[PDB]
Design brief:
The PDB classes it as ribosome. Keywords: In situ, Ribosome. In situ human Hibernating class4 80S ribosome. Chain A: 60S ribosomal protein L7. The structure is cut from a larger assembly and holds chains A, B, C, D and E. By secondary structure, chain A is of the alpha+beta class. Helices cover 32% and strands 18% of the residues of chain A. Chain A has a two-stranded antiparallel ribbon. Chain B is mostly helical. Chain B has nine helices and five strands, in the order βαββαααβααβααα. In chain B, strands 1-2-4 form a three-stranded parallel beta sheet. In chain B, strands 3-5 form a two-stranded antiparallel ribbon. In chain B, strand 1, helix 1 and strand 2 form a beta-alpha-beta unit. Helix content of chain C is 20%, strand content 31%. Chain D has a five-stranded antiparallel beta sheet. Classes of the chains: A alpha+beta, B mainly alpha, C alpha+beta, D alpha+beta, E alpha+beta. Chains in contact: A-C, B-C, B-D, C-D, C-E, D-E. At the B-D interface, helix 8 and helix 9 of B face helix 3 and helix 4 of D. Strand 7 of chain C pairs antiparallel with strand 1 of chain D. Bound molecules: magnesium ion (20 copies). The site of one magnesium ion (MG) has 2 residues of chain A, from loops. Chain B binds four RNA strands through helix 1, helix 2, helix 3, helix 5 and helix 6.
RNA sequence: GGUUGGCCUCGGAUAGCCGGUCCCCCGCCGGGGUCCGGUGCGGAGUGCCCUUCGUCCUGGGAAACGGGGCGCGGCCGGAG
RNA sequence: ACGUCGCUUUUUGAUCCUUCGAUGUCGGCUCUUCCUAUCAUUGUGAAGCAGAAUUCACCAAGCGUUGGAUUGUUCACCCA
RNA sequence: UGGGCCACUUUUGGUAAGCAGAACUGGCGCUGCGGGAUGAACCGAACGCCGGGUUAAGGCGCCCGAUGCCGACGCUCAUCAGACCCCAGAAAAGGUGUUGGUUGAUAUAGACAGCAGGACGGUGGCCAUGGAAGUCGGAAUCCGCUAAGGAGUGUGUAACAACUCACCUGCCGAAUCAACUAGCCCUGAAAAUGGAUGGCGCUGGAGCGUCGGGCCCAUACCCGGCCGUCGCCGGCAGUCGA
RNA sequence: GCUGGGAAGGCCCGGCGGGGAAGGUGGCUCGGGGGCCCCCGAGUGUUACAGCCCCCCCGGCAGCAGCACUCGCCGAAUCCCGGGGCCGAGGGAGCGAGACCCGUCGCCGCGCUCUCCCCCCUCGGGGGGGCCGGGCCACCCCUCCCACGGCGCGACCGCU
């Protein structure tokens, strides 16, 4: 079997709105520059960024 | 459409015919439903009679003459069902309700007209053959309707005249086919044009 | 897990290499899932119960759809499964007729929902086999094992009920 | 009362779906709702098909259930289902619907004229027959 | 589960002929003609042979409840054949502790008068169903004979008499008086 | 103020229907029973009918036992 | 019986949501309507229902459910 | 401002409470809008004035925009059916209603059910008593003849007797029986003005479970116009046709 | 484009075969039928007067996620054309002549001429081929290094 390299690039889209968001999820979304619904951004993938993606 | 839509209520489910009719009269169409005693309601007769008796129990405690009016004729029962699907408390709903005319049996204006049928409301296709159903005519008669017998006799007399008219129609159709065989040499020129274009296989 | 028409997937995974075990064993599962993302997720769900494996501590070395080998041949599928009812857990054996293994499993998911109100997260497919006709146990499946099968279509219900919506002729049922 | 039956070899007409308008042969029966079906001479490869979209015809082919497409094709061609079907009133009603739908404006005009003349001659002969039938005098 | 086919066949004797009008069975024998329609049941009735006159009832794609109607129709038709060949004869015994029950057969065996049931002055008048004739047998002291071609009508007439002679406000285990169906047989005894 | 050709009618069945036709019965027409057709309804509402540029020479067919009178008079049917 | 599951809001509690620029606070009398968890009457089923009487249960609220001594009483109790 | 209140979850007192008291986050208060028929808090989403497109949550029989799909597979008949977070009514226990599943057992060496025969001797076995003979009870629980028949499954008698079952056998000829389990339905299930899946109504579904494709529209998202605020402490003194 | 370098499948009576059966063809037997001749049901089984599945000593042809609509994910491995709807905000872009009928202007993508020959329609206008040299790849020879994967052969190290 050939296992390809784990992808190093992600595209993240915010799908929920800005109402009733917990403080930690709100902070990580601000750090991902997703302050609006249906906003998108490219995220370089590593351990630090992935564990932020799991929060949000 | 622009003309009057006459429907035969026999073999039609009460609420499925009423939903179709209510939409039609809201679209500005004049609808006439005849033979409302032939309308069927799904479910056995006893549980449908219980439903109407519960309707009979709803009355104004203070003054029943003000309270809900329980109309016993099958035509008025169907009319009230359509009214439950119309916005009858607005001017638009009242105009739509005025475009609907309902009859028990088939009165003389419409007994000499062709009657439509709504397949999406017929009992034969909408209801499993093993289920039970009630007749609106029998249900109405047992909650107060007084004219089941006279409408039955008038419907039988109407069906006798309709049988006579149909026999003349068959006789004219048989004579039509005989004529079509007689004038054949001078008709095949126009018959082949029809056959070429898909009319008259 | 939601549904659609299910597909079969061969998912092969292993633990990540460690100093203790340079070459850990490879494990293979048959997963019936709407898509490969769900298939990989369900694979970790099962190997976590069976082995002491994890998505973080392992990797999936292969995930490919398994095509039906004989999609033009009718066959009988026996399916062994376990599902959670409202008051317990039960093992069930069910039989279906289909042309594809994935199609028969889809039939099973609809049938468990219809008869037992079981959702797809409750159901746990553990074996699917193509059985011979003489090994079938369900009379509903067995009544189609007739080389001279023959039946009419008795009560044909009109389905073009709104084309036309109004017509003079009442529909015919016998054909 | 029933005259047509779902059975192996029975030819069915597909009334709707991806293969509407074509003939098929029933090769096998599955689970009361579908059937392994195959039109080898009508461009329908072997596949499952619900009974709801089929309309049984009067033709029945002779081949064992789940035989290969080769033997289904041999039975189809030997029985000449394509020619026999085209000669039925069912197929001619289908063809008449098709050539009526594709009728153009000029063709509608010529049909209007031909039907106008045809109806006038026929109804004239009808009136002539009515008078002859009315000429009865016998106690 | 829906069974593909559930069928059953009855055999019609030589002296009786069966005609079908859709789901309306007409059984014509030496003793008369019986009609019964089964339009409330969706089945396929067919006459099989000109040699032995088999009637076959088919039910295609039936569930549990409507597979129970195949044997019901076959038994109803067999009762129809039995009625038009042998007829039905329900005997009734009138039993009483003290007061003899007096039975008077009115016009043509169509009206039955029960006079002295449990010694009361009220006179019960039970009308037999059409086609059913009641009589007083000469073989037993207190016995009624109900004869007819339809089993449904004959047994319903016998039940009309049985339920007419009902004790009220007493212990019916002690007060056993009344007229009861003693045996259910045929006429012509073949 | 709407509207922008008409349909002048069997009863119905739905595990069945429709049409036609010779014999029997009911005062010269209907009801039955044979027999023959049709049935994914073609004697088909997915249908049918009517179909509007108008006139003038001018032929052939259709008809010619025909067509139109807010023309007269009489009679008949229809009562829900 | 030991246990266990409920329903009801004609008891009394628990709470304090509405009302303190005020919703007149007990009982009786008068009068109407409703409920059924039916005392009687209609029709029934069961009994350790022989009859009479009684008891249990079902459909059931159509109809009726009284006159008095004592007490403000509601309740209570007795006479008939 | 220093009266707070609500929801998920954790949580204390209380039988409980739309009760009282805490922790965390969010909300309402201060907030309109789409949906939940209706509603301070639920679900979606937060808002300048507009046009077009697309959605969320939620829906698409008719009211009422949208399934007028030839939607897929089943389940379910209710003489109080059922019908969508919060949420606006139910339990234990039952059902030979029907559906699926589990385990076990019997059967061509003749199942099962029906109809039809037998159902014996020691022995009216012992101890019990007023009488208990298989059948009020305490213990025992055997043997022979057998195809089989318990020193007895029930009815019955004061005791007997007389029936009946176990068990064996004939006719019948092929599948059958039991105990569980959990889906829908039913029983359990009684309140006061006449009434509430929102209504009409719906039973080849407009119900329940699992799924597909279309479609509907919020003040949300995208494109565009216009208004204002903020920011660029932006540009212009070069009016420098030379 | 990829995949199991798709799975099935079509045609080649696929041929030398082997094996297995049953939802059992023919035949045979039994039980029911139509004028000792043709049908229906129940048994037997291995090809017969049908077919099915697996393996081949091996396949060949076509097509190829199919324009016989069985079952996918895609596009630096993707381009062309058409239709419906809403909209048109802005208003001195001239570094050149010293603007003056007028900023048809910047960035970007192209065409022709300042070269010469032809070719085809057309009475000068239109539509084409180019016009000489270089590399790079495709075809043939033989030619080096590296990467990745597989196999084999060793010598060293570590593990029995
Ligand atoms: Mg929210
Ligand atoms: Mg019997
Ligand atoms: Mg008494
Ligand atoms: Mg307060
Ligand atoms: Mg408080
Ligand atoms: Mg006041
Ligand atoms: Mg007041
Ligand atoms: Mg009660
Ligand atoms: Mg609190
Ligand atoms: Mg405040
Ligand atoms: Mg705030
Ligand atoms: Mg808000
Ligand atoms: Mg709202
Ligand atoms: Mg609500
Ligand atoms: Mg908008
Ligand atoms: Mg709505
Ligand atoms: Mg709408
Ligand atoms: Mg309930
Ligand atoms: Mg392609
Ligand atoms: Mg402008």
């Amino acid at each position: 079997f050939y296992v390809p390299a784990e992808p190093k690039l992600a595209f993240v889209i915010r799908i929920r709105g800005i109402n009733g968001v917990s403080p930690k999820v709100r902070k990580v979304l601000q750090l991902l520059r997703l302050r609006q619904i249906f906003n998108g951004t490219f995220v370089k993938l590593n351990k630090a960024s992935i564990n932020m993606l799991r929060i949000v | 459409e622009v003309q009057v839509l006459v429907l035969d209520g026999r073999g039609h489910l009460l609420g499925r015919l009423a939903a179709i009719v209510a939409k039609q009269v809201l679209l500005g169409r004049k609808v006439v439903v005849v033979r409302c005693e032939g309308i069927n309601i799904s479910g056995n007769f006893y549980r449908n009679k219980l439903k109407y008796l519960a309707f009979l129990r709803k009355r104004m405690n203070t003054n029943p003459s003000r309270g809900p009016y329980h109309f016993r004729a099958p035509s008025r029962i169907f009319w009230r069902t359509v009214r439950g699907m119309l916005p009858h408390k607005t001017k638009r709903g009242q105009a739509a309700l005025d475009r609907l005319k309902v009859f028990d049996g088939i009165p003389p204006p419409y007994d000499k007209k062709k009657r439509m049928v709504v397949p999406a409301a017929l009992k034969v296709v909408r209801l499993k053959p093993t289920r039970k159903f009630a007749y609106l005519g029998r249900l109405a008669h047992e909650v107060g309707w007084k004219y089941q017998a006279v409408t039955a006799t008038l419907e039988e007399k109407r069906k006798e005249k309709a049988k006579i008219h149909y026999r003349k129609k068959k006789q004219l159709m048989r004579l039509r086919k005989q004529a079509e065989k007689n004038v054949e040499k001078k008709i095949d020129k126009y018959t082949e044009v029809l056959k070429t274009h898909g009319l008259l296989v | 897990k939601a549904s659609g028409t299910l597909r079969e997937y061969k998912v092969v995974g292993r633990c990540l290499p460690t100093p203790k075990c340079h070459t850990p064993p490879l494990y293979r599962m048959r997963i019936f899932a709407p898509n490969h993302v769900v298939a990989k997720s369900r694979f970790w769900y099962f190997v976590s119960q069976l082995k002491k494996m994890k998505k973080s501590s392992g990797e999936i070395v292969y995930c490919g759809q398994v095509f039906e080998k004989s999609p033009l041949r009718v066959k009988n599928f026996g399916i062994w499964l376990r599902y959670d009812s409202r008051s317990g857990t039960h093992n069930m054996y069910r039989e279906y007729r289909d042309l594809t293994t994935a199609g028969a499993v889809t039939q099973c998911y609809r049938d468990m929902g219809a008869r037992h109100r079981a959702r797809a997260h409750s159901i746990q497919i553990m074996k699917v086999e193509e059985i011979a006709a003489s090994k079938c146990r369900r009379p509903a499946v067995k009544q189609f094992h007739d080389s001279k099968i023959k039946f009419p279509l008795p009560h044909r219900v009109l389905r073009r009920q709104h084309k036309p919506r109004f017509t003079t002729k009442r529909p015919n049922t016998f054909f | 009362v029933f005259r047509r039956f779902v059975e192996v070899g029975r030819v069915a007409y597909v009334s709707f779906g991806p293969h509407a308008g074509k003939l098929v042969a029933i090769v096998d029966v599955i689970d009361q709702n579908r059937a392994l079906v195959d039109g080898p001479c009508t461009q329908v490869r072997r596949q499952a098909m619900p009974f709801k979209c089929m309309q049984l015809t009067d033709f029945i082919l002779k081949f064992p259930h789940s035989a290969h497409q080769k033997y289904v094709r041999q039975a189809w061609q030997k029985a000449d289902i394509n020619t026999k079907w085209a000669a039925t009133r069912w197929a001619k009603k289908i063809e008449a619907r098709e050539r009526k739908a594709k009728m153009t404006d000029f063709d509608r005009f010529k049909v209007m004229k031909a039907k106008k003349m045809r109806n006038r001659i026929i109804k004239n002969e009808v009136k002539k027959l009515q008078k002859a039938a009315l000429l009865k005098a016998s106690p | 589960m829906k069974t593909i086919l559930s069928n059953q066949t009855v055999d019609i004797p030589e002296n009786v002929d069966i005609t079908l009008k859709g789901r309306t069975v007409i059984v014509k024998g030496p003793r008369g003609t019986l009609r019964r329609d089964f339009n409330h049941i969706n089945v396929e009735l067919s006459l099989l042979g000109k040699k032995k006159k088999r009637l076959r009832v088919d039910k295609w794609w039936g569930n549990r409840k409507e597979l129970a109607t195949v044997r019901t129709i076959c038994s109803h038709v067999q009762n129809m054949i039995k009625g038009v060949t042998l007829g039905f004869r329900y005997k009734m015994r009138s039993v009483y502790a003290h007061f003899p029950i007096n039975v008077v057969i009115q016009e043509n065996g169509s009206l039955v008068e029960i006079r002295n049931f449990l010694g009361e002055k009220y006179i019960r008048r039970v009308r037999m169903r059409p086609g059913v004739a009641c009589s007083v047998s000469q073989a037993q002291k207190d016995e009624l004979i109900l004869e007819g071609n339809d089993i449904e009508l004959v047994s319903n007439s016998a039940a009309l008499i049985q339920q007419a002679t009902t004790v009220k406000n007493k212990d019916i285990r002690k007060f056993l008086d009344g007229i009861y169906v003693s045996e259910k047989g045929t006429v012509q005894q073949a």
